[PDB]
């Protein structure tokens, strides 16, 4: 079996195997690196995601939300409280304040050391979920909006037809902003690339160890376990490497920088924090190994994470017991 200590897999493509996006997934596959739950792919030297990032700063951001933390500094909770709205131009202004500013560190290892003893002690301000790309029409090579759907994946695996769409979001991010402890919306691979700005730190658990990461959550947060049978798809928990050490999890960590794209795997859990102001792109999407998985995965039981509209016909033909069962 190929890459048995489930590492992740850094990934450097040539300009002509940048050309089929479906098949260097395969590739990746066939060399071990789905056991890790994560990949780092560097693009090729004469690729670029668009010509400059110039007028970036007309975007709006509709919904910005505060990160307010709950717990200890290893484990905790955060909730988002919405403010009002701001262009990217004011968010960028805002991360750079002397209040919200990346502090003084020697490395990423420094700066990793000081998010977790200090990250509870702040309330950043995160830009999540925006509907919409950075890629120029013209980029022809991994143009998150110009994938090939997972409604046609499951048209072509499995002669299925159904409503629904498929497009890319943004998320601008600064010091210490952070997504908890998940797997993808019905268990489905996501892909991510880093526009502009500072780094992204990830931690990641292989999937075939993903029921362990599970157990303890249960054991950390016994009150949210006893309300919902998924409650990890509210997206609120966070675990810090050491704890996770102390009781024997499985698990890997990498910082993605701009310029490079990072690709999840079906039930790879992940987490993981921003180091300054930045702007990522991220969509899900499927293959034919990813089927099984969509069959597999758990569902929120009592109301908190949301069902998007494309959503319920997959849960609808993979799931029909669960979506009868919702009536
Ligand atoms: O912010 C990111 O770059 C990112 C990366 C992977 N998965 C995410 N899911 C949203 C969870 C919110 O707590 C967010
Ligand atoms: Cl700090
Ligand atoms: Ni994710
Ligand atoms: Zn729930």
New binding site residues.
Partial sequence: AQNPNCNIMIFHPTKEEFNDFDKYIAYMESQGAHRAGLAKIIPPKEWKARETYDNISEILIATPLQ?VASGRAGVFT?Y?KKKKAMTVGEYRHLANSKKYQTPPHQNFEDLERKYWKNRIYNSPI?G??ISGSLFDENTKQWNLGHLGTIQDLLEKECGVVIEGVNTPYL?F?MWK????W?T?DMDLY?I?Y?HLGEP?T?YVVPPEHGQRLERLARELFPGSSRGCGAFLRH??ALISPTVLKENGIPFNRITQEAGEF?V?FPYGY???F?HGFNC?E?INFATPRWIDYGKMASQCSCGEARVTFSMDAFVRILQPERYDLWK
């Fill in positions: 990160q955060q988002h995160y999540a979920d998320y991010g902003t952070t997504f908890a998940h993808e996501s991510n880093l992204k990830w997206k609120v990072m999840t992940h987490a993981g921003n990522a991220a």
